[PDB]
Amino acid sequence: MKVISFLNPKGGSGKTTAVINIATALSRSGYNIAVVDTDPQMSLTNWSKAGKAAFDVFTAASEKDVYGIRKDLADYDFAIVDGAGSLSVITSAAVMVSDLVIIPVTPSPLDFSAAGSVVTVLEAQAYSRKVEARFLITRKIATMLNVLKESIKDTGVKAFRTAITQRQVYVKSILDGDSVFESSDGAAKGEIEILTKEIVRIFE
Ligand SMILES: Nc1ncnc2c1ncn2[C@@H]1O[C@H](COP(=O)(O)OP(=O)(O)O)[C@@H](O)[C@H]1O
Ligand SMILES: [Mg+2]
């Protein structure tokens, strides 16, 4: 059983969109996936209500639910935590039980600051058990793209090779209650797929 958490208190980092699609790609690979929504706005929970999720969706009522994910979702291959906002406990709880922390970040310069709060938590965790961490560029298109790439290197945490390109298909699919794999967008499905293999490769 492995836990993957998408953390970044900043809203609009692209956590839910990534989670929904990467979780779906993992299912397509034959893995049993459990996703836990920790956001109060329940973006993912509501999306799943459409009934098209290719995995199991859970809605956390508090940090307590995150705290007991290892035991609760122990029968799944992967348990993905869809990060919250202001509730900083969620981040600490997630990091504490995660095997892979992914930090979705956009090229927005004035938004990288929030992603750093997660790194601070990671560094602290390192004392107990260093958890693999990766930055993930989302809503990719630039110069600020390069500046972001340098700020990331300063954190000591590497970024995934594949970035989530900004595409309407990501917005529409979630809106229709499904993922990019329910569309005919090969490029979109492709990067999500390649990205999903970089995740799997990290575990292998
Ligand atoms: N890869 C993407 N391509 C196009 N728009 C995106 C992408 N990722 C996120 N967005 C847009 O930005 C918003 C924030 O994404 P979301 O996954 O909800 O973020 P968090 O998970 O940051 O709340 C979406 O509602 C959508 O409008
Ligand atoms: Mg979200």
Q: What count of residues does the chain have?
A: 204
3-state secondary structure of 20: helix
Cα separation, 41 vs 107, whole angstroms? 24
* 8-state DSSP, 73: T
1-204 to CATH, choices 3.40.50.720, 3.30.70.141, 3.40.50.300, 3.40.50.920: 3.40.50.300
Q: Is 166 in the pocket of ligand 1 (CB under 6 A)?
A: yes
Q: What angle do CA 187, 190, 194 make, to 5 degrees?
A: 145
Q: Alpha-carbon distance 116 to 99, whole Å?
A: 19
Q: Which residues pair with 80 in a beta bridge?
A: 4, 35
Q: How far is the CA of 155 from the centre of ligand 2 (A)?
A: 23
Q: How far is CA 47 from CA 24, 58, 80, 177, in A?
A: 13, 12, 16, 5
Amino acid identity of residue 174, one-letter, is I
In 3D space, the residue among 15, 142, 171 whose CA is nearest the CA of residue 80 turns out to be 15
Residue showing tokens 């492709």 = 190
140-to-14, 25, 78, 191 alpha-carbon distances in Å: 11, 20, 26, 12
Question: Are 164 and 140 within 8 A, CB to CB?
Answer: yes
Q: Distance from the CA of 197 to the center of ligand 2, in angstroms?
A: 22
Q: How many C-beta atoms lie closer than 10 Å to residue 132's C-beta?
A: 16
Query: What is the Å distance from ligand 2's center to 142 Cα?
Result: 25
Residue type, 150: E
Proportion of the chain in helix, strand, coil states, percent, rounded to 5: 50, 15, 35
The strand pair at 2-6 and 33-37 is best described as unpaired
Residue 27 DSSP SS3: helix
CB atoms within 10 A of CB 167: 18
The dihedral built from the CA positions of residue 131, 122, 24 and 170, taken in this order, carries a sign that is negative
- 22 three-state secondary structure: helix
Written as one letter, the residue type at 160 is F
Provide the CA 142 distance to its chain's centre, in angstroms.
24
**CB neighbours of 42 closer than 8 A, spacing ≥ 6?**
59
Ligand 1 near 12 CB (within 6 A): yes
| Ligand 1, atom 13: closest residue by C-alpha | 12
Domain ranges of the chain: 1-204
Give the DSSP H or E segment for 82.
strand 78-82
Question: Which of 17, 19, 111 is the pocket-test mutation for ligand 1 (most atoms within 8 Å of CB)?
Answer: 17
**Structure-token pair, residue 86:** 């202001």
Q: What is the dihedral of CA 194, 187, 172, 25, to 10 degrees?
A: -30
Does any ligand 1 atom lie closer than 6 A to the CB of residue 91? no
